[PDB]
Amino acid sequence: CDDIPRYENELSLRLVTSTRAHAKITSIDTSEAKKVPGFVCFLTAEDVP
Amino acid sequence: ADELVFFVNGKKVVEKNADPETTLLVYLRRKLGLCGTKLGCGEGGCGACTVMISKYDRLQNKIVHFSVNACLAPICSLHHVAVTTVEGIGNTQKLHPVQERIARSHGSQCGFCTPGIVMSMYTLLRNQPEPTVEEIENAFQGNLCRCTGYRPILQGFRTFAKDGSPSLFNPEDFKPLDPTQEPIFPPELLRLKDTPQKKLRFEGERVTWIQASTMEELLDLKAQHPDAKLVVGNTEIGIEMKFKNMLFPLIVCPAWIPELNSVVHGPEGISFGASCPLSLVESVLAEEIAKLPEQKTEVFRGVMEQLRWFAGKQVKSVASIGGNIITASPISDLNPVFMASGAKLTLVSRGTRRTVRMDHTFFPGYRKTLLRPEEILLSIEIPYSKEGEFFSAFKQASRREADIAKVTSGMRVLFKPGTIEVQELSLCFGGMADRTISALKTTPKQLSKSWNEELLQSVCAGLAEELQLAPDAPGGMVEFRRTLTLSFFFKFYLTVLQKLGRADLEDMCGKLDPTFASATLLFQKDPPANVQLFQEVPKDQSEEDMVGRPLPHLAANMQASGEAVYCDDIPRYENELSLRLVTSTRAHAKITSIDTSEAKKVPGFVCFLTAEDVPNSNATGLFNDETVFAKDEVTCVGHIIGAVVADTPEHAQRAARGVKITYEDLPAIITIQDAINNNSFYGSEIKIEKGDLKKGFSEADNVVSGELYIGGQEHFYLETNCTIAVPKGEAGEMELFVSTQNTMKTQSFVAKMLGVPDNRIVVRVKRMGGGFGGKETRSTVVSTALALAAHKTGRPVRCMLDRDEDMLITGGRHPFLAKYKVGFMKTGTVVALEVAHFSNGGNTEDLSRSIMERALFHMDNAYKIPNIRGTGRICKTNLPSNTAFRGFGGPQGMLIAEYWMSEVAITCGLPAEEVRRKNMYKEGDLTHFNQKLEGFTLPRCWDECIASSQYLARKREVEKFNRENCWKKRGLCIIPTKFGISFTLPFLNQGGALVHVYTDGSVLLTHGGTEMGQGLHTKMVQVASRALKIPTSKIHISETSTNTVPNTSPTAASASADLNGQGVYEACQTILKRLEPFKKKKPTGPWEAWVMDAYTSAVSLSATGFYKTPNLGYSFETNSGNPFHYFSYGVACSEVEIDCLTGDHKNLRTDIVMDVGSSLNPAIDIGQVEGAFVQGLGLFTMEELHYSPEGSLHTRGPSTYKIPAFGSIPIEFRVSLLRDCPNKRAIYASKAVGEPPLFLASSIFFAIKDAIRAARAQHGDNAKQLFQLDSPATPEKIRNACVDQFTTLCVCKSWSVRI
Amino acid sequence: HFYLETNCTIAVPKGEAGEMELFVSTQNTMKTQSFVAKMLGVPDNRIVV
Amino acid sequence: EMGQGLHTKMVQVASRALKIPTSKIHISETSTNTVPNTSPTAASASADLNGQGVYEACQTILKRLEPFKKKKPTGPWEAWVMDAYTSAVSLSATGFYK
Ligand SMILES: Cc1cc2nc3c(=O)[nH]c(=O)nc-3n(C[C@H](O)[C@H](O)[C@H](O)COP(=O)(O)OP(=O)(O)OC[C@H]3O[C@@H](n4cnc5c(N)ncnc54)[C@H](O)[C@@H]3O)c2cc1C
Ligand SMILES: O=c1[nH]c(=O)c2[nH]c(=O)[nH]c2[nH]1
Ligand SMILES: O=c1[nH]c(=O)c2[nH]c(=O)[nH]c2[nH]1
Ligand code: FES
Ligand code: FES
């Protein structure tokens, strides 16, 4: 699969995972991510169609 | 400065390295990935690339909106504007009203023209939210469609207009337009309208562009660097660059400068800055014409009349008045008007200013003016007319709308006050020399003459001697062009008599004879009136069974939104390369050597592929007589010699120019006569004969012999040929995405060239933007080249042909020459017929012999002929190979039949409809090839058409018009057709499908047929939904692919719904048989329960389906066995009004009755009837290809090749599908429809021939009774056949030869 | 498991009718298709794995 | 295919079933749009299940070719196939097993 050439407009995705065994998610802050060059979006449960 | 900053769909674009050579079309598609805007021609004629521009106009102080051709708009001209594309107005989640209406009204077939037409309509609405019907039609003068026949587009959009059987759509369900919901004008651009504009400089690979902010800067630049090339609209410079390979390394754009954009009203006229667009000239002059006295606006009206027919909205929004003047084209429509009116031009340079009156010295030589190199044109003053000064302007082209003049003229006379005595006379012409000319030797002689018949004869004699053309004049048509100069003067002569009459000088100059009045009328059409009649389905049919219902094409919403993906719209891989074909510039020659040294220097060059690089076989083509790449010799102009591979299409094009070929000429065979002289044919004579010819001719009362020539036809699919080949790096596997009707032959030809098994090669077709037969085989000459490139490099490679390459390489319909002899009785009954057909096949066999077989199978058209002999021979020539075109030989065979049939009636002195009727077959009769005519509905179509068209009463009105008009004539004809359905090669009548039902109940269907706009997937989803008894919403077709259904026939022969519809039905019946136990246990539980129960019982939910048409196979040796499964029938009656002085005509009304059996889908079928009919209207009256005597195609783009335009179609256009005529042997009792209607447009050709006959009766001096009308009957042929006092005055190296 | 190639998907949207093709290192094309289609709320006939 | 040589085994099975060499048969990929509703490749069972499916698809092709093989008992495979195509006989088939 990863040997297939990328399209010129292809994007890359990285999963964000829990660092706790069992917790409520109290909040999520994406300010720092939004400053990284090339950032497009952070998908969460609210984006599921 | 430096950055180029503009907005697209409301998003800011900041381009830090703009190249002056980059068009907005390339920037949208390739930089921003917005592929809804399409390339259809790259030369401004087709509108497929239309987008809207918005800007803050600093001169008028307001936001303005206008449309442009993105293919010709340099991005460097667009600083601080806002572009809107089709994606910017709506998408399938929220369609704009314009998108919704064109899709729901069946205005989108192939869909490739849809976004451009949507953007033309959208821009009109942004400017005028309540347009008139007339304004709506005018919005599309710059837009072409090859599929729909235009009617449904105009009908759907009439719902926007101020003054605007079941139904094909319901306008009552269209959502209303809310103008407040349009995209905001970008707020930065409003802030920036404050700050002053500064000069910008952009530097590309080869070109520097300066956007000049002030006159001072422009004149300083031009004084320092007089070579700096001015660019305003780029509508001429873009063509020089793209097509004449002209490279101007320094451009200056002065469009921002207020002095070049001003409009000032003076005592003698109105002065326009030289950069004012023609759209602003039109709005200004129209306002003046509406409020000033007629006596002052004669010259303004002459300019307006020329602007009527000057391109369309996209060109006129950016084309400048100064740019037309300085261009100095021999065919400028405006320069003859400015020369005749002595328009005042102001010229400036740094430190200088002068004023000249335009006259003959202004244009001293080909494309030259009297400007100095440092000078620019500042302004032109268009003058008021004086008392006793009258003006006319004229243009005649090959098509009325959006064409290049063949002859264009401005004519002005000024009389001595209170007399009819000439004080000044100026007659100026384009199209008659290498520059705009004045008839300076003729006009002085008329000074002091009274406006009378002797002045008319003197001027005509003067022009006929003064405006000579050599036999070799570029463009040919020398007799027609000279005849037009005199005919235009006659019109002016009569107009001036009328104007003298209105000034109360009728006693001095005489009244105009009322039979002459219609000669001087300016062109006007009645508003359109259309009828579509079809049959409702039974009342008991379920609402979920869509068979026979008018379901819109399944992709129409996505086509209207630009979201439907065609081949070149697919994103490129990061490592993808571009391929450009290198073709022969000689008709027949040895290749002595090839030099690629310049090509190797182009940045991004990869390699030049030739015959030596072919891994396995260089022999390709349907009959294995074609090269992949030429070896040792070339055999036509356009013969592919090799292919350049580079990183980008620009680098590949530039590298292709540096491939230098040296040739040694060999004897060329170009024409049908050359071929006959050299015995150069494809195979032997083909022949069908029945009865006893000797006997029939001896018994005939009368015998008539003659010949007919029928020109060929370019398909002009709006999407040209395109292939992407993706190598997989394993086992020779490759996947190709191709715009083709023939996935099986594409796969076979690629596999053979490579030397790998067919199982390694996959060919996928999602859709084509039109095919029409041109992509049945000829697509492969691109696919094989691109596949070799991908194999050699291991990289994906793409090629989409430019229109000029596609028209030159891929061939067309076959020209036919036929010699006939027909025997018949005084009653009009035909008793004997012998016809010899010859076709021009070009340089490979391809489908030419089957095309000739079909012409011979239809040489009877609708008529029973007891003694008959037809032969055909296919000429082998040094021209591009001709191929399938919708009709496939049928239209040529049947035009010849109707042509001698027309002569039969005239020779007998009997009404043509009676002669055709009494020769018609009857039910049960055998054709000349011995096939019985069963289910023969032709007589019903004939009676319904003749009744519903009121053909008899209309004959009376045509005769009355002709007796009351000398210089315009009407004609009326009704023509039948019979068209045999099935491939002539019996085994190609087979189809396959594959269906899967997933565990959610949803159904994925595919079949061998390919979608090219004909709505085949829509029909197959309709069929599968009836067969499965589930809603169409549960079934989807994604694509056609050789690895889902193998060994498929091409989508051709009008047969693909019949063949694939049966395959689909059988695959669905297999699924239903497996679900039957589950339906029995749960007779009510839904489809989804049956499916899940089958799955968890381990029952297969996938099946193939297959069909072959039974009982086919004709022998030419025994004249027995059936070539066809059944026949299509239909009749069309059409009326025309010809202009006997110019050769132009109006298509006044056409009524068609078509047998489509029990239509699977009447919306799509009516669309097929209208689209096929309009392509036949183009074949028989407008479309012509010209070739040099050395075999080089001259006609290579829509500027020269004139397909029907929105304004070409019959004004009253009525189409009825025959009722109660089920055809039980094809799927759900339907009939094929794609090709049979096209020949019905011969009703227009014969109405024209009737009108010419009436003109020859009026003015001919004992003219030949059986006069020749070859096809196409263009304005040239019509005008030359209308022999009169003007033609008689105007009577071997040349520009073209007849092929 | 320590498969030497870790999990990998490329998803290629086609822009039409919810259609999408996915190239996946998976033993289960059918559940990959089903799960993608349920998340998006499109039928299984639009999703090719 | 995950390294277990399933496609190699299915090519071996198709070549026996059709009586042509393995060189004439190719598997390029697995896709939900050529065979739907498939179980995971798991439970060691995939050559058992797909090898029967493959065998049945090949038996269907051979039944279709049998009249051509009768008319031409030695003429090669390529001839029976082209005779079948030009007689308008389908050369595609599904196979299934439970
Ligand atoms: C699809 C299409 C249809 C067309 N139809 C017609 C038609 O029916 N009739 C017709 O007559 N033409 C037609 N044309 C030709 C063209 O549109 C006109 O000649 C147009 O007026 C050129 O204006 P422009 O602003 O685009 O010129 P540009 O291409 O920008 O420049 C044209 C020439 O004028 C020069 N120039 C521009 N302004 C000045 C100035 N102020 N001083 C000195 N030099 C200047 C340029 O240097 C260049 O040599 C058509 C063109 C297209 C693409
Ligand atoms: O009899 C036909 N055979 C074809 O291969 C073909 N192609 C086409 O466009 N019409 C036809 N008609
Ligand atoms: O009985 C089994 N079911 C499975 O789904 C499975 N998966 C696997 O790896 N082994 C097994 N065995
Ligand atoms: S592509 Fe621009 S007008 Fe044809
Ligand atoms: S629908 Fe207009 S060109 Fe095809």
Ligand SMILES: [Ca+2]
């Ligand atoms: Ca073509």
Ligand SMILES: [Ca+2]
């Ligand atoms: Ca040919």
